Subunit: 502 residues, 2 copies
């Protein structure tokens, strides 16, 4: 019996869903339930992107599966350069300011080679040219070393068809494209599997075929990238049990709970709820809203998307020479970080040793820097940019701020609570109510009530014994989200879902 967490891919910078799937895999491994990540998209770098987080046997990519490259690792290094010069007698001309080379057979231009690294150890692509220097084919290499896909071009280097190979060079898939809105769109897929040919019109049908090949009685699927995975599961038999996992607000308009359309990404799942054994959400609050909206037609369960490590590091080493306020938030409009500048503008009068450090990045940085300069707050408000590790930043933090008009469950806030940093947040869906108990580990403020925000922040600055009480509540709150609590939640859920299904 295998648990499959179905997403799309892994990027160089992991998304929220990608992290959620990897975290869930690590819990199932600790727990001792077999689990694997399932990836759908063709990604010839996926093995590189996965290397720092999961083992080869921890995932199945759909294209790797039909290419007979599932569980395959990196080949011995190959020096294409010596092969082309010593064995093939080609002339290699380096392209300056690149890891590229033009390949000639005497005066005849044959190929343009791109290497990923400047040591020329990772071949990326090789373009082929005809007698008129038309680019007719592109060979795309997997980071593991094998030729993954040849792309046949027409007209102005438009994609016509693609052939996907196993590591030995046998064709295992073919895709044919027609252009729509200036982009290639799949019109046909052929697959060589089980000594047969199979035919599909699109990647959703191919996806559905792939799910059916994985499944054995006892297995359980999680639909984690629902924009892609729900249409797939919708083309599979109800005998295959699947749980829909929501990673964001379920509706376009959070203030019209009953009547807002569902988010476009969840539309295919919500329009076929009877397909799904349950929905998982991150917060009790979202659970109650979704259950109400779908009239309890299937079970809805809240399971946090991550867990807290108990901290051994120095915690709360404060001094009264600096009052340090923190925000861990993308510099995006929804976070309303300008309001935190306005708060410090008002507060500095009453203690001028105040500092606000804002950890994140995005489009709003220019506007935030202007306001800082405008208010003369350059020795008080810092845009700290992105910091992968925040652990030293939490030790002297007095208080976290959230001024967002919308939220999701925050692993960032969970980590700052594990470090004993209390928080004052607008009362907005979803996540703040999950991680904040009024007067226990922080305060919830009426959305956009800057005056109430000021009064509450000032109250905690004026009452360090209240700060210390809230800090102890922050440690206690974080400990409810332990590795062991999450395991127990996951174990019980999987047990009950399978019993009901069978």
């Amino acid at each position: 019996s295998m648990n499959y967490f179905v997403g799309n891919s892994l990027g160089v910078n992991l998304t929220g869903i990608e992290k959620a799937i990897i975290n869930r895999l690590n819990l199932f491994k600790e727990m001792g339930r077999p689990a694997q990540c399932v990836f759908l998209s063709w990604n010839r770098y996926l093995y590189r992107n996965a290397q720092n987080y999961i083992t080869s046997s921890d995932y199945i990519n759909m294209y790797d599966f039909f290419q007979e490259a599932t569980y395959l690792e990196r080949n011995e290094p190959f020096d294409w350069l010596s092969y082309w010069t010593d064995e093939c007698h080609y002339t290699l001309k380096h392209v300056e300011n690149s890891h590229d080379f033009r390949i000639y057979d005497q005066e005849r231009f044959l190929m343009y080679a791109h290497f990923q690294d400047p040591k020329y150890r990772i071949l990326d692509y090789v373009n082929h040219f005809d007698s008129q220097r038309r680019k007719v084919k592109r060979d795309f290499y997997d980071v593991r070393g094998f030729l993954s896909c040849s792309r046949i071009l027409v007209d102005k280097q438009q994609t016509l068809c693609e052939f996907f190979y196993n590591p030995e060079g046998d064709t295992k898939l073919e895709k044919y494209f027609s252009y729509k809105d200036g982009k290639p769109e799949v019109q046909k897929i052929i697959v060589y599997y089980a000594n047969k040919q199979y035919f599909f019109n699109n990647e959703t049908e191919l996806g559905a075929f792939f799910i059916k090949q994985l499944y054995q009685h006892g297995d359980l699927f999680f639909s984690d990238r629902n924009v892609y995975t729900a249409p797939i599961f919708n083309l599979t038999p109800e005998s295959i049990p699947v749980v829909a996992v929501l990673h964001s607000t379920h509706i376009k308009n959070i203030d019209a709970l009953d009547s807002s359309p569902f988010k476009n990404v969840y539309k295919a799942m919500f329009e076929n709820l009877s397909r799904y054994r349950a929905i998982i959400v991150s917060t009790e609050q979202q659970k109650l809203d979704v259950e109400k909206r779908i009239n309890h037609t299937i079970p809805v369960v809240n399971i946090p998307v991550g867990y807290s490590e108990t901290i051994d590091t120095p915690v709360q080493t404060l001094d009264q020479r600096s009052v340090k306020l923190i925000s861990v938030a993308r510099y995006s409009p929804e976070k309303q970080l300008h309001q935190q500048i306005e708060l410090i503008k008002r507060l500095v009068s009453y203690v001028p040793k105040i500092e606000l450090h804002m950890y994140g990045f995005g489009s709003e940085s220019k506007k935030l820097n202007e306001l800082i300069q405008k208010y003369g707050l350059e020795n008080h408000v810092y845009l700290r940019g992105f910091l992968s590790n925040l652990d030293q930043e939490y030790s002297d933090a007095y208080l976290s701020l959230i001024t967002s008009n919308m939220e999701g469950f925050s692993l960032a806030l969970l980590e700052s609570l594990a470090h004993g940093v209390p928080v004052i947040s607008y009362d907005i869906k979803y996540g703040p109510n999950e991680l904040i108990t009024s007067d226990f580990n922080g305060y919830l403020i009426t959305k956009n009530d800057e005056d109430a925000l000021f009064d509450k922040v000032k109250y905690v600055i004026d009452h360090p014994e209240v700060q210390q009480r809230l800090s102890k509540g922050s440690l206690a709150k974080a400990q409810q989200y332990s590795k062991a609590s999450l395991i127990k939640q996951w174990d019980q859920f999987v047990r009950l879902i399978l019993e009901h299904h069978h």
Copy 2:
């Protein structure tokens, strides 16, 4: 050491060059010199055409070579319809008036299939369709049963590229097209990749792989093979064979341009060890024209086979004239009909049988009706076997304005049938000595034709003597005489090359 006879392919109906090549192969095996026909064009029906003439071990096709399907025989039958329904669960809808099918997966139209046989044991081709019914790919099957080439289509079913497979389905060649001509050829050979701009370069590459020190090449289909040989090294010995007149107009020996099919050869004479022609008469013309730049050698393009049928069983009942000639303008066959219109008043039981086919059928047959000669002149059409037709043949007629070495003439002479021919190039002078085995007549002199034909009919003792000369002329062009000429030529060509 191998002898290679390089043509292009084998049609349904073998051409002159194709028969010449197979005939020459037979001779070489008989004398104990290894010989193989070499073919160039992709032809997934080639094994079917070769079947009744040569074994698979007697030829190398260039596409077969790189597809690892040379010396490969027909695959054991395999039921496509039992695969598509029982193993694949597809649905087939027959198309009216065809050996075709539409393959559907449930309601989904996937493929258009096309067989040869009504036993549907020989797949021809399968068209693949996308979700919008666009024809994306055509699969072309070898008559031997393996999938040979997939063609990828774009736009208005235009050829973008083609993939050639070995029988196990490995890609061995790729071709890329712009508008449709080849701009690129990839071949997977000897554990690497070779690149060419066109099929002439692919041709030269193929020749270089075939050649081992001591082999000899013959260039038989020169319009294709000369340009190929022109891109191969001089260390590879090749002889050009001319199977026809070398110039567009035979009356301008000095000034006439070379035939288009022979240009690339004559414009690179030093590449060739020699030229072979069928007649001494042609040899002397070509030698003169090229200022003896390279040897020219006359070797007949066939031989007189041993007689296994009765000969010269004549009867006063009927005087049987024959013509063994394509029904073409150059054979000027109406002249023989005219000859009969004139003779029939002197020889009431004369008959003329004309064996052949071509454009002139209707004109000739109407001329017979016009002269009331339906009891006297027969358009016999094409006969595979003419052995029974010669036994009662009094004489053969050639009234052509132009000829080549005639296998037909050699056959009828081997049957003791003397011949009255116009004295035109080339072939008659080779095979006819006047007053020995027949008479040579001034071209288009129909009065002189009438005079000699009537003379031989009026004097049966003359016909008997010209018959004994016919058997003797045929004996001179025996298989063994032809063997000895080829044997010495090959040995002498190779001797001088090394």
